[PDB]
Design a protein around this ligand. Structure first.
Ligand SMILES: O=c1[nH]cnc2c1ncn2[C@@H]1O[C@H](COP(=O)(O)O)[C@@H](O)[C@H]1O
Ligand SMILES: O=c1[nH]cnc2c1ncn2[C@@H]1O[C@H](COP(=O)(O)O)[C@@H](O)[C@H]1O
Ligand SMILES: *Cc1c(COP(=O)(O)OP(=O)(O)O)cnc(C)c1O
Ligand SMILES: *Cc1c(COP(=O)(O)OP(=O)(O)O)cnc(C)c1O
Lengths: 823, 823
């Protein structure tokens, strides 16, 4: 028994033991030989060779927490956007050098292999990426932490552009296996749906529930070189498969083959209204996670440390659930169902525990975005969960009246239940009620969570409102993707910045020196070259390495403002064609994102951006002064290529719409200069980088409210501005669409007659901020001089910080930059 | 490249490298650790320490085959009754001794761990088990063989007796994975169903077909210590999952959620009439194996060796295809299909090759049993294949006309098209026409196919019919299951017997040496002691390890006669209790079988065996002079546990019912006497042992044919024989059934008025033979000596013999027992 140990199984940094274990997984785990392997095989071979390294540590880390019994914190979220784990496993595990040398000797080129990896499809955007980043920084900072979510077979769509039209292909990233997960069919848990609550004697009973099974899969997450590796644990839905003869539902009728498939596809697709699948999904990931969380609390030596009921008294001293957005919110009536009905704690011992154990991050600014479910949808598949939502609610509103006696209209403003046609439940006031702390994601955004959106709750409990600004991981977003920039920096300062990012300000001391200043425009020359080849070898065009790489890689929504940017490039195209000879600083403009299937404005816009380009890029006069490029199927491993080769990071969202900008922080730290409105992220970045150092522009928040107060009359601008007048005119003539002139008709009328977001307002200012830009590119010494200052200044934008604060003010744990002994 | 070699990965019989490998797998593979591990988890680590050694050999053996280009033989069966891979994989590879040592130091019990493996639910009966025996033999004699079937996810049922009634439970054997297979997605092939045949220009084209996908799984098969490890490749059906958006069938309607369930379950269950499911499991394994077969032909250096068509002229000289019974029959219109339509050989060239490629093994006797598919089934799911079956049928019938000019009643009896209500196609006559050798499975059985069942095919082509008697492997069925018996036998004659079983004749030399005579009984005393301990510790009864373990482990049907051996147990009762103190040599009768859901007689026969024992085994007079046990859920792992432990092997079918009897042969080898009729396998086993050493009995066939010629009037026997009368009258009075007396009334009436298999007829002679049995037992020197002349005469029943004759007389290759150098 004790002879079964982790002890002899590694010669880690060793190009010869790593050549031994690559061979071991290709013939014995893959059961192939060099006579028939494929790149895919040899990548699988290599993913198990860096993985036994990771799971060597994993067992130690984990053992360590069970004998050291920290508070354990569960980050719950419905999207985890990991993307390729090979390079990140190696660079955080130290192993990249040994692996390169080893695969080299074995006559295999490790880069060609890292490009066989499928981006882990469990994310779709920001929110996903964000949790992805907090998992890194959590483990780097040694927290007893876990990420808990659904595993999505089909990701979410894979974008194809055919005809200058977006077609979504399916992403089955798992089609050939995933080398990093470990399934767990022994920890399968039941998840109950529908049914009836029979109230019997000392509780309520929820009976006749259908059931779907939650089957786990553990992917590990490695710290930065400290040998702590923690668990991400995604659930998968598996139907009961009695459905044959067993139960005697069937025999007579297998039409229940629909139980079978509707179940299995809880886990099949990410979402992408009030759907019984979304709510089915949300309940899924909460109900399994909470049985697991409770099980380590009964196990994790607290089986011994009972003193009370294996108490729930200690439950808040031992566990922390972070709800990410409102999709986790039933974590609160579900912990209240498990605690009350299953265990037996009275409602108030139970609710003490719940509030003290949860917390809720918010990411929305418009109230037309806070989740809301139909009470008839929660009565049908969740009936106990609606009674508890009602009893939480009663009790919360009795607290409210004992604070503001006689306010009546507040009792109807703060409720969980909302009345209209279709009485609904408000998922966010459920969360503020059942959390001990709420935090925004931007200072601007949590002030407006306090001041307007949740202000009566901010009066009733001011002390719940905190703020915790979002961040990026230094690792992925500078060391993995940007290694020259991480080399030259390091030369001049040290390593420690990658685990204490603000140290970057020491590079301020180098602002004039002509070393950094050429190096930086060197690396930056590197990056743009490589990628200016990727733009020919996988996808194709004729870039110009020299140019302004002008990129907005933003979700394609109206309010994100691609169309502002398409007028501007139609502006440049015009000038150069009237003035076939002006020295105009050239640009290669690169817009990238995925629409949303069935959002036809977004499908019309990616139509715009191709059609412009086919005009410009095939017109002689423009030659190679002006190229427009649509980056198909923008995603995390295209992020890490593009964001290093960029100069101009285009942040133009209407002001007030953005709650932040994580994608934003990522172009600061890789010396891209940020054009953009004074919103969300752009604010704290300008604060650090110095306003002078940032191309801030257009309508502030204020000015928009004012233009709304007097009413936005689009046409006026169209009639001052002679360029605009003409570009609208070229759009409606069919300049840019000769086969269907009429093609951009809707777009026209979008802008002219009912633009919700004031593109034509911010035009005139935009094209003059852009004039400042072209003008400063062509002064490389100073252009590059600013960049050094933006980079230097990036350290509040590191996720390690963001975590340190959830850690210190919300969770109650001191981080630790220590190295866990191990391997 | 070349440095990626199988070479440095194994210190084999090294208790220090096996423990190192256990530990890599518990931690690295399973991502478990000794705080969390379970006995299931440790068996998977042992499972894997061993598999590295297996697959090692498999890599060197398949390479070997591609560099020497042997004739590859493919065994086509829908049933492979493997049972348990681990004790068997260690013995073939010599590792049993080192793993015991190794796990013992780690302080884990290798017998504990072995008992957690699930019996590979890939079969059901003697057809499956033969195919497996053949597989161990084809590898032990250096045959370049491959076995091909379907992977059934649920097996066929698991048995469970509840109040003595059979309840079938499911067999999700695949539930915590199976660690011996390797799923190969990369090699998925489509299989086509339904459709319509477009007849265009140079060919017909099968168009508009539904497509199910066949994914392969490989399980390696080890020879006995000769280091050749061969392939079993079982197929899994998967639906194409575009079903969501892609095709534009879906969207508007997903009621084609059924294609998906009705595709998915070709691979779901084994069977268990004219069902589309069956013919769709039949074509599927055929469709998907003939492509992988024509792929190795085109690939395995015969690309090089084109000279003409990659001529399929050489196709017989390099492929051979064994259709085990009629379920692979479609391999004859599908090989012809591929070659005529896909390639473009003319009909006659293609038929030369199909006939020289295929060979049929038949296992039936009654003609009611020969497979038959209605032409409306074939016309619908297989409309090209119906066509080909018609040309084949026309043309064979024109051969027939030239041979028997003007014999018309022959033209109609030799047809593959059958005329009656429902026009059927006769899949047996298909097989004799496109195969180049038909064969029986025991000499009497070969002979009735030639004189009665296929005799006009015997007449037009006498060169085709062979015989190749069944055979059991000495490894599983003696070395593996009864190692004691192998050991005393080894002391005297060495090991060569295990790979050369005729050599057990040497044991005759020692019939009269008294060490052996006592070692043999000793051996057996152990086996029964062991077993008796199971019968209290996994199931419960009170054995008395001293009595005569009397056993029947046959399929529960009416011709298999357990009601005969029911009657006989009640006679022995009736006698111990009429005369409570006379001496009766005591027995523990054990009868086990699995009913077959839907057969009501079978189902009451086990209710019978289970209640006889309720009475006899609690009736205090009987003391321990009888006991009766229904063995729960007979499968290969209970066979290697009961078959060692027994004395008399109950082989009682009515004469003329049995073609052969794999069961039987395992009993002779493990020193058990065989009481039973002169049918099937009993014939040649009697002939090598001599009559004198067997307890043959009852109506011989020529007699059953007489009693039918005059008409078996049951009543007469019930009115001569008094003890018969007595038991019938016990059955109807409710002796055994006191709460519903009337319960065995349909058994009683069967017996009385319509037994097709003449129980009463053999009853009188039967119980007489049991008296000669008890008699001799009660004389341990001479009972042990008759036991030693059964074991010594075992030789003809070695599946290495049956294989060598297939190879030489049908497949056209030579056994070699040569060690491939390897590892
Ligand atoms: O009681 C324990 N003591 C030490 N290590 C443990 C114990 N329970 C679990 N582990 C380790 O913790 C990991 C995670 O366990 P889990 O929290 O139950 O998922 C396992 O892989 C083991 O390495
Ligand atoms: O052309 C070849 N040369 C050498 N080994 C081969 C070749 N093709 C296949 N193999 C080996 O044969 C194994 C089985 O391939 P299969 O028989 O094609 O299914 C592969 O896994 C390799 O070990
Ligand atoms: C960082 C990131 C993001 C985040 O994108 P942004 O914060 O810039 O804005 P939204 O698109 O509006 O959220 C999204 N996707 C990936 C791949 C990524 O790396
Ligand atoms: C050998 C065997 C069999 C086969 O049983 P029998 O050969 O006795 O004859 P039938 O009953 O007629 O098929 C079945 N099951 C197991 C486990 C086994 O080992």
């Amino acid at each position: 028994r004790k002879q079964i140990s982790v002890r002899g199984l590694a010669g880690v940094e060793n190009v010869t033991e790593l050549k031994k274990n690559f061979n071991r997984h290709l013939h014995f785990t893959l059961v192939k030989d060099r006579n028939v392997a494929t790149p895919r095989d040899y990548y699988f071979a290599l993913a198990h060779t860096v993985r036994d390294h990771l799971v060597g540590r994993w067992i130690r880390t984990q053992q360590h927490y069970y004998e050291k019994d920290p508070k354990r914190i569960y980050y719950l979220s419905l999207e985890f956007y990991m993307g390729r784990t090979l390079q990140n496993t190696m660079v955080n595990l130290a192993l990249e050098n040994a692996c390169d040398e080893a695969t080299y000797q074995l006559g295999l080129d490790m880069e060609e292999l890292e490009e066989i990896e499928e981006d882990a499809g469990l994310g779709n955007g920001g929110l996903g990426r964000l949790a992805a980043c907090f998992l890194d920084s959590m483990a780097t900072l040694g927290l007893a932490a876990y990420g808990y979510g659904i595993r999505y077979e089909f990701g979410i769509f894979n974008q194809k552009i055919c005809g200058g039209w977006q077609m979504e292909e399916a992403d089955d990233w798992l089609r050939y296996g995933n080398p990093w997960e470990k399934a767990r069919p022994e920890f399968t848990l039941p998840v109950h749906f529908y049914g009836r609550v029979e109230h019997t004697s000392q509780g309520a009973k929820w009976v006749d529930t259908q059931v779907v099974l939650a089957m786990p899969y553990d992917t590990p997450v490695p710290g930065y070189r400290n040998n702590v590796v923690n668990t991400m644990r995604l659930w998968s839905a598996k139907a009961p498969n009695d459905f044959n003869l067993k139960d005697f539902n069937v025999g007579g009728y297998i039409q229940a083959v629909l139980d079978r498939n509707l179940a299995e596809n809880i886990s099949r697709v990410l979402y992408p209204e009030g759907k019984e699948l979304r709510l089915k999904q949300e309940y899924f990931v909460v109900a399994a996670t909470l049985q697991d969380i409770i099980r380590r609390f009964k196990s994790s030596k607290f089986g011994c440390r009972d003193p009370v009921r294996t108490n729930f008294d200690a439950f808040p001293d031992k566990v922390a659930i972070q709800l990410n957005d409102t999709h986790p919110s039933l974590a609160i009536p579900e912990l209240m169902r498990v605690l009350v009905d299953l265990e037996r704690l009275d409602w108030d011992k139970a609710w003490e525990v719940t509030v003290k154990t949860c917390a809720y991050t918010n990411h929305t600014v418009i109230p037309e975005a806070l989740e809301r479910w139909p009470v008839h949808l929660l009565e049908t598949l969740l009936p106990r969960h609606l009674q508890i939502i009602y009893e939480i609610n009663q009790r919360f509103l009795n607290r409210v009246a004992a604070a503001f006696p006689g306010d009546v209209d507040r009792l109807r403003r703060m409720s969980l239940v909302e009345e209209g046609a279709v009485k609904r439940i408000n998922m966010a006031h459920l969360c503020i009620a059942g959390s001990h702390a709420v935090n925004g994601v931007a200072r601007i955004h949590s002030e407006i969570l306090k001041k307007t959106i949740f202000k009566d709750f901010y009066e009733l409990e001011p002390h719940k409102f905190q703020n915790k600004t979002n961040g990026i991981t230094p690792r992925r977003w500078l060391v993995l993707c940007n290694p020259g920039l991480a080399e030259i920096i390091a030369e001049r300062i040290g390593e420690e910045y990658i685990s204490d990012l603000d140290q970057l300000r020491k590079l301020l001391s180098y602002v004039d020196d002509e070393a950094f200043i050429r190096d930086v425009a060197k690396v930056k020359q590197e990056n743009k070259l490589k990628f200016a080849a990727y733009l020919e070898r996988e996808y194709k065009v004729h870039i110009n390495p020299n140019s302004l790489f002008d990129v907005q890689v933003k979700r394609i929504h109206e309010y994100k403002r691609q169309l502002l940017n398409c007028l501007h490039v139609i502006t440049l195209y015009n000038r150069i064609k009237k003035e076939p000879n002006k020295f105009v600083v050239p640009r290669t403009v690169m817009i990238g994102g995925k629409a949303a299937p069935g959002y036809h404005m977004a499908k019309m816009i990616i139509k715009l951006i191709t059609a412009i380009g086919d005009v410009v890029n095939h017109d002689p006069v423009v030659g190679d002064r002006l190229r427009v490029i649509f980056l198909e199927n923008y995603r995390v491993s295209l992020a890490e290529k593009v964001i290093p080769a960029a100069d101009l990071s285009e942040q133009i969202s209407t002001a007030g719409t953005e709650a932040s900008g994580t994608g934003n922080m990522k172009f600061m730290l890789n010396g891209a200069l940020t054009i953009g409105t004074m919103d969300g992220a752009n604010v704290e970045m300008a604060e650090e980088a110095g306003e002078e150092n940032f191309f801030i522009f257009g309508m502030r928040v204020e000015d928009v409210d004012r233009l709304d107060q007097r009413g936005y009359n689009a046409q006026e601008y169209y009639d001052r501005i002679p360029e605009l007048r003409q570009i609208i005119e070229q759009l409606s003539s069919g300049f840019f669409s000769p086969k269907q002139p009429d093609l951009f008709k809707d777009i026209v009328n979008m802008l002219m007659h009912h633009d919700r977001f004031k593109v034509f307002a911010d035009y005139e200012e935009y094209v003059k901020c852009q004039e400042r830009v072209s003008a400063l590119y062509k002064n490389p010494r100073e252009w590059t001089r600013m960049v050094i200052r933006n980079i230097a200044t990036s350290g509040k934008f590191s996720s390690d910080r963001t975590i340190a604060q959830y850690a210190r003010e919300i969770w109650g744990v001191e981080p630790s930059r220590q190295r866990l002994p191990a391997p």
